[PDB]
């Protein structure tokens, strides 16, 4: 499939938490205005990752989903502390195209199947945060803090068996840096699954996206490099097309 460029919007209390250099926007912290902007400059999909306190998280994420869905016409995923079927179902019914589950999927893998059978596998993204531990890629839950003891090579296979539609694969080893995506990890996972793999963590330069796609990623996710205009979406897509990557150009 043609590769996708995905913008990640970290949100809390209904607002974007990261700064941007988009001076043409009224309120860069409004996730709806910023998501609509990204959808108009060539981003293929959005991911919203919420870190609101649990007491207000449910209503905050539902309010976000409905306001985003009514203004944007590209697919979006919502995630961050989705712990059960009822929560995932409510977010999809409110307008989210896809939900991302991570900790809850590890602790109850059948949850993947329950959501996929109700709403289709396309509605289910399993986010996998992985790190090298003692010579093996290991799966971490709770925002990258808990070593589950589950090997990445086993979990990727299980996630597909359970009905996930996509894997959002973050390298804890590269996340927050601009050194490059973890192409070793992406290549390692690639033959273990037929599912789309979204590369996440490490983006710094246009060549990094090319390398991630040559490693087998189906999509590449980034945040601050887009927000700060360290990478321009149109320039990136033109660069990828010139180097032989099949990208979506319906800007």
Author numbering: 2 to 252
Share the article's original sentences.
We have studied this problem on the example of the mobile active site β1α1-loop (loop1) of the (βα)8-barrel enzyme HisF, which is the cyclase subunit of imidazole glycerol phosphate synthase. Prokaryotic ImGPS enzymes (including the ImGPS from T. maritima) form heterodimeric bienzyme complexes that consist of the cyclase HisF and the glutaminase HisH subunit, which supplies ammonia by glutamine hydrolysis. The active site of HisF is located at the C-terminal face of the central β-barrel, where two conserved aspartate residues, D11 and D130, catalyze the cyclase reaction. Based on the conformation of the loop that connects strand β1 with helix α1 (loop1), these structures can be separated into an open conformation, where loop1 is flipped toward the outer α-helical barrel ring, a detached conformation, where loop1 is not visible in the electron density and presumably flexible and a closed conformation, where loop1 closes over the active site.
To assess whether the mutations have an influence on the conformation of loop1 we determined the structures of the HisF-G20P and HisF-F23A variants by X-ray crystallography. In summary, our crystallography, proteolysis, NMR, and simulation data demonstrate that the HisF-G20P and HisF-F23A variants have opposing effects on the conformation of loop1. However, whereas loop1 primarily samples the open conformation in the HisF-G20P variant, the loop1 population shifts toward the highly flexible detached conformation in the HisF-F23A variant. Whereas the G20P and F23A substitutions decrease the kcat of wt-HisF by several orders of magnitude, the F38A substitution has no effect on the steady-state catalytic parameters. Instead, the G20P and F23A substitutions likely influence turnover via alterations in the closed conformation of loop1. In contrast, in the case of loop1 variants HisF-F23A and HisF-G20P, kobs, increased linearly with increasing concentrations of PrFAR, which is indicative of a simple binding process without involvement of conformational changes. The HisF-G20P and HisF-F23A variants on the other hand interact with the substrate via a one step binding mechanism as loop1 is, in those cases, unable to close properly over the substrate.
